Amino acid sequence: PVPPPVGISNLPNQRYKIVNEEGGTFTVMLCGESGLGKTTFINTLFQTVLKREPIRKTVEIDITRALLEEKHFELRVNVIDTPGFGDNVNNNKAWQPLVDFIDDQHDSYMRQEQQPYRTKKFDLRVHAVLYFIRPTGHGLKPIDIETMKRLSTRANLIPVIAKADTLTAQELQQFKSRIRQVIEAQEIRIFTPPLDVEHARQLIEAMPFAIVGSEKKFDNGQGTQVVARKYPWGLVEIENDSHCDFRKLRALLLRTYLLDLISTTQEMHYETYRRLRLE
């Protein structure tokens, strides 16, 4: 070639190398009442075991920090848990510890940024909030609406239906439609992947994602061990798109739009918090 080309086309690859060397961080909150398969879900997603008295519980935040590695890429995972949320007779203001935690992480990063020496950076801003909805089959509850509305303005809210294997296809379709209608009418902004596009549209059409989780594997019939729930009347395959939307949620959280979650967390939620705090 005369002239031999400039290496402009190698600039993306250069950035790839930088990213693969500096690793990544992902912070995810698992909001919901007890017994919604939140611990099972997080262990199913990362294919590992991250998370293993008084009748009246207190709504508290429990952080689990882990370092995962695959293909020489290191991810620092912060799993934020919400034990006690919505598990009592009186759950009034159960959302406050959660929104306060999110706002506190935004505020902490804001004040770290202003330091003259800011080399070390303890970033714990929540990149995604999975709100687990009990599969009642009817619709969203007042606690669900209130909590989701307050979380949506400070973090990427991803509503999900817990234990979707406890509802039939018709029941699940109706429940998802009613949830979507409530989210629209109550003006609750949920995280949606950018459309720059058919795969992304399919991901959006499935929202709220119908989740099934399992940390066990069973024979699918073709001699292969697949992650599934074994009922005496059938096997619920987690990786089967016709059984649950786990693969779509994994695409949104890690495989395709993880960067979009982190960037929207930093450039939208955090930037709005900072501007309102400094004004």
Partner: protein, 294 residues
């Protein structure tokens, strides 16, 4: 004719409407947002009526259609009664049902209203019994048995479960029910049953105790299945059989190896109908009366 009264208490989304319609083998109770005795052996003698409620100013009723703009409103607590005739061997059955439990930010009003309704029925019977011109054929409205529907969490009992079951136990027999047992595998269901029994023992929840000696094998088998794990469905297939059709398989409700639904039905309308009725009206009511007449 035998007057029988059964309460269905629990949080929304526990299959109470499905249980009632399956029990009567006809869709008499519509499901939420979806507001006829097709069974020849069931007749509606007094349609569903509100017997006690406690909501806020302008709160849509339990019959209100799906309104997304008003989904944010807490429903309060509402109790209904439906009187049917089943089948002398005829049974005048009154099904009491709760609405709003688990849907309020503060559910204290729920247990308060359930106790108010139950105690008001005791007070009605006591006032009639105290009258000079009494009527022995008076319409008895006392709840004889109550089924508390436990959400399929898989862990155990929560504060609302304990509060409501202990509140109801003062007036009637309480049967905790593992609802939507198809939400669990065999191992998970066994563990959930053990966990619930651990909680009822820890929190002194006075649930009904299934127990001549001929009844040893039967009653022991009833005490082993506590809480009864049921799978219900009010939708039929082409063959006319009640089923739940999942993408991965079909659950036929009639099959006895999946659920204790048929065992529960034989307990309610067969073996223990009169045991529940006698314990309610001759022990619990009498203790209430003794306290009132101190």
């Amino acid at each position: 004719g035998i007057t029988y009264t059964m309460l269905l208490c629990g949080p929304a989304g526990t299959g109470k409407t499905a249980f009632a319609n399956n029990l009567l083998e006809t869709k008499i109770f519509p499901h939420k947002y979806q507001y006829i005795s097709s069974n020849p052996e069931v007749k509606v003698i007094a349609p569903t009526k509100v017997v006690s409620f406690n909501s806020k100013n302008g709160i849509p009723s339990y019959v209100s259609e799906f309104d997304p703009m008003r989904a944010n409103l807490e429903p309060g607590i509402t109790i209904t009664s439906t009187s049917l005739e089943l089948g002398d061997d005829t049974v005048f059955f009154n099904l009491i049902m709760t609405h709003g439990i688990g849907e309020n930010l503060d559910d204290s009003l729920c247990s308060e209203e359930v106790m108010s309704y139950l105690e008001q029925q005791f007070d009605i019977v006591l006032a009639e019994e105290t009258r000079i011109k009494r009527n022995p054929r008076f319409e008895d409205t006392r709840v004889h048995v109550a089924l508390y529907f436990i959400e399929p969490t898989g862990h155990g009992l929560r504060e609302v479960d304990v509060e409501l079951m202990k509140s109801i136990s003062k007036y009637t027999n309480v049967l905790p029910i593992i609802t939507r047992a198809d939400s669990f595998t065999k191992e998970e269901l066994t563990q959930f049953r053990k966990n619930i029994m651990f909680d009822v023992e820890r929190y002194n929840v006075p649930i009904y105790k299934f127990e001549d000696l001929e009844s040893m094998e039967e009653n022991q088998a009833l005490a082993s299945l506590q809480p009864f794990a049921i799978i219900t469905s009010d939708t039929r297939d082409s063959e006319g059989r009640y089923v739940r059709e999942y993408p991965w398989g079909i659950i036929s409700i009639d099959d006895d190896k999946i659920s204790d639904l048929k065992v529960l039905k034989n307990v309610l309308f067969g073996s223990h109908l009169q045991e529940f009725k006698d314990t309610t009206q001759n022990l619990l009511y009498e203790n209430y009366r003794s306290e009132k007449l101190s």
